């Protein structure tokens, strides 16, 4: 079993005594402490080569210091605004994603500096086994699947659709994604699918109760007009059939 270093355990104990005192927590000297925590925590949790048993051992050790110390450390964000949940999703380290979720204190809706949540990162992450998709759907159910990115206001569903990821689209819809959300430019997931020519994804979106094919983007384009213009007459016929 992996154990914290003397220095790390020391920093955890210092946090424990200070965690309830906000202005001490923000003090310049306390920062050297917090930097130790951040450095060692990201070292063990956030590389592609992170070892799940080590992350598990570290989580258990933080909670033994204090549940509040566990909550503080596993929600730390680095200089990129990334949490361990962002990195472990991006790396498709779904055993580690599961350990973080099961600690039951993750803020899954945290936007990194790029403007994206871990649910949005999952929409593009490699998933090589259906069991990994179980962890992805747990993630989807722990946070806000309808959140909009700071860049262009896109949702996870729009991201998945734009990459033609039928698997992710099915997952997101099964976990309650709203098909009708519009990004900052007024585009829907259905419009994204129409641009890319993704026929099966169009059928999946149209099959959702309440899918609104009439929505316009800020220039008055519809999924139907977009499909024709992008040269996807088959989707256009599909859209027409659904709208009428």
């Amino acid at each position: 079993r992996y154990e914290l270093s003397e220095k790390m355990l020391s920093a955890c104990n210092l946090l424990k005594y200070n965690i309830k005192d906000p202005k001490a927590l923000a003090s310049k000297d306390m920062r050297i402490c917090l930097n130790t925590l951040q450095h060692d925590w990201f070292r063990v949790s956030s590389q592609k080569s992170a070892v799940p048993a080590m992350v598990g051992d570290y989580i258990a050790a933080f909670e033994a210091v204090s549940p509040d110390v566990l909550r503080y450390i596993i929600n730390m964000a680095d200089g990129n605004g990334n949490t361990a949940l962002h990195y472990s999703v991006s790396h498709s380290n779904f055993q580690i994603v599961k350990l973080l979720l099961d600690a039951d204190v993750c803020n899954v809706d945290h936007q990194n500096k790029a403007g994206y949540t871990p649910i949005m990162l999952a929409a593009l992450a490699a998933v090589e086994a259906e069991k990994d998709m179980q962890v992805v759907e747990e993630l989807f159910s722990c946070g806000d699947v309808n959140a909009k990115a700071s860049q262009a206001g896109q949702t996870a569903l729009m991201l998945a659709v734009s990459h033609g990821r039928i698997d992710m689209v099915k997952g997101l819809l099964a976990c309650g994604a709203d098909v009708n959300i519009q990004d900052d430019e007024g585009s829907t997931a259905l419009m994204c699918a129409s641009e890319h020519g993704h026929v099966e994804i169009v059928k999946l979106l149209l099959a959702q109760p309440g899918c609104n094919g009439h929505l316009e983007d800020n220039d008055g384009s519809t999924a139907l007009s977009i499909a024709l213009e992008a040269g996807h007459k088959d989707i256009a016929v599909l859209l027409y059939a659904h709208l009428n």
Partner: peptide
């Protein structure tokens, strides 16, 4: 338009 653009895994992770 964002709906036409490609976003990469690295673009989601780093600004």
């Amino acid at each position: 338009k964002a709906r036409r653009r490609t976003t990469t895994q690295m673009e989601l992770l780093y600004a």
